[PDB]
Amino acid sequence: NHDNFRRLIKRPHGIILVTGPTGSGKSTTLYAGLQELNSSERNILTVEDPIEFDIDGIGQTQVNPRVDMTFARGLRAILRQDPDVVMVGEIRDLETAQIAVQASLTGHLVMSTLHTNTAVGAVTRLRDMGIEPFLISSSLLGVLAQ
Amino acid sequence: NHDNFRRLIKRPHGIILVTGPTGSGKSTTLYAGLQELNSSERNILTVEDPIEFDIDGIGQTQVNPRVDMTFARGLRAILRQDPDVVMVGEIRDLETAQIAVQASLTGHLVMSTLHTNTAVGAVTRLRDMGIEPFLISSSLLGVLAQRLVRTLCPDCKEPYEADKEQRKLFEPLILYRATGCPKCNHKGYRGRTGIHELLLVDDALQELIHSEAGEQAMEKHIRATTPSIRDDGLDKVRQGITSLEEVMRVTAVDMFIKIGDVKGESKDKTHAEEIDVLAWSWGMSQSGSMHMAGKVNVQDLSFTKYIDKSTPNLMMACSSGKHYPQAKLTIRKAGGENQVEYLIITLKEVLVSSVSTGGSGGEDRLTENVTLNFAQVQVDYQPQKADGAKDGGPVKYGWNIRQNVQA
């Protein structure tokens, strides 16, 4: 499972989702994935709500409602920093997913989470919000039900 | 490629797409196309996200999310400025494509991009979003599948003769290798160049899009006319611009029957000019009751067929009572000509025992039933494994009915 996840998070582009219920240790798994990628040869940035803890060597922006800094606006800002990999806290709505799908197609490796009970539930959930059935097939690398 | 692209972008109307993966230099190609058109006799406007750089003499609006100015709304606004040519950053969704298709039909030349791996992938992608298959044929002028390849540094590249597997891709044929050095610093390349594949929608391609032939069928007709992405790259390898390493990285059963030498109207590749069978029935019965010997009674092999060019020949054979040397009923799994001919019933010394034809006022193709009497019969079925491969050889059935013995 580690070797398969290693190869997936080390791809040049695509979306990798980690799914399950609340308190299933998704962040811990994402944080471990980013720490593994944390090298001098890549630019890793994240949007979180809130930031669980600080990874030294990786940029981490926080979702601030006082200045209307949302996941969508935060993710849209990160893409102008010339990133190689991006980690979004979670893709709750369509607007945030649309940017993440565009990000994955445009040479970035995207990472996020979805509150779905199964690994098929994640692919499911993207189809529900309003992502064209195709766009999921092209971008999605895999899902990790945990 | 330039002259073909020139003529396409200088048409009065239609959509021209540039496709490929991220970092393939699509914008650079579009920007070069707009700069070529940039004249005082045309009104050129663009919607971009973001604007890569400023072309002086051309209007360029930017996709602003602060005022909800999207590609669709931006493109819908540009069309009210009386444009001659329009360049959309990219058509990501259906709504933006719908406006671009309407724009192309309504006297505007439209330009855009799509993240698809092939030139057929662009036509593909428009069909996926939900553009009616027709609308693509009418509007689309062509597609430009583009990749970038690193240029071998001319100061330090190594000449080498290609091997057999390399020569098969394309008389001392010398290619060039990467190496590494101080200008080379210290890789085998410095700079880049584009490799292309310009799909040009002509009368033949307008049909294939309309009737939905498909990627494969459409790819077959495309290779007949337009050179591939790889072929354009391989030409640069011959010229000595890029390496071969760089070009490669970015790169219902079917049933037939043959009665003697009587020709039918089968369009099958293997079973050409035979009789297409629609249905068939054949059996026998053993009179030898075990409750106390008897004898087998082999029935005539009935089969249905369309009324084709063999119909008069079978009627003549039935009327005259002249027998054919051999008749072979071949059955085959669903897929095509390369599938396993799993059941083959060979008949010898074959008469046409009856012919029953006719038709109704609703039928487009009339059918008829034909029965076959024969002296001998041989049936060869070929076993198959779970994957579809042949499980050993085919076991035989062979009986001489005239002599009442094994054959």
Place this chain on the structure above:
Amino acid sequence: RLVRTLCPDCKEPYEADKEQRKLFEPLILYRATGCPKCNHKGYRGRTGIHELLLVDDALQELIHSEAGEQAMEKHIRATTPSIRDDGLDKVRQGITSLEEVMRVTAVDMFIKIGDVKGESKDKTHAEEIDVLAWSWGMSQSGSMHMAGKVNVQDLSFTKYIDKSTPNLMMACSSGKHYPQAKLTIRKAGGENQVEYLIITLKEVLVSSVSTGGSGGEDRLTENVTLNFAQVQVDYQPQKADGAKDGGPVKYGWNIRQNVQA
């Protein structure tokens, strides 16, 4: 809807393809092009295309009881022409293109028995008998398990009750034979299509006539069988495009004398 009008000075005539012909015998439509009055698009001016839904007694129920869009759309297509059909009529007339309308949006069988006239409205096969169905066969008594003889059946065919009905009944009653009878089968399209199967009979009797009708039928039908001395079947093969692939393949047989013909 509004549709741009093709400029009459510069529009290109073209024969429609199969997928185009399926939307609507040389059927010519017209294309956009571009030119100095055309300036430089394929159109100048406009015209309206319409679909007038007219609320009658049937539609007053469907609105009341809430049948629904689909159910209501089904009854609407029975009476009123569509928006597309009104547009396609203007494409036939040569006003607008098929591109402009879309953006805003069985074998024929006849038989001629002697000189008896039917009621066919066909252009080529005028005043012949319209065939609805037919059946004919033969059987060889010979066997390969050991000669025999052929037994040609009478050619049956279905037809409407037309002006030939009494003449065929008279021929069956009197037992007088016609010099020739020719069943002609033809592909779907019209008079210019290939007559791909022609069965010519000679010295033809009317062996039986079975007629009738029901209280629900608008046009009554009847079955007629034909006995004959000789028979000739001419099948014409065709290529993929529809053109004739060589000459027609012949089968001829004299049943009276039991020989080839």
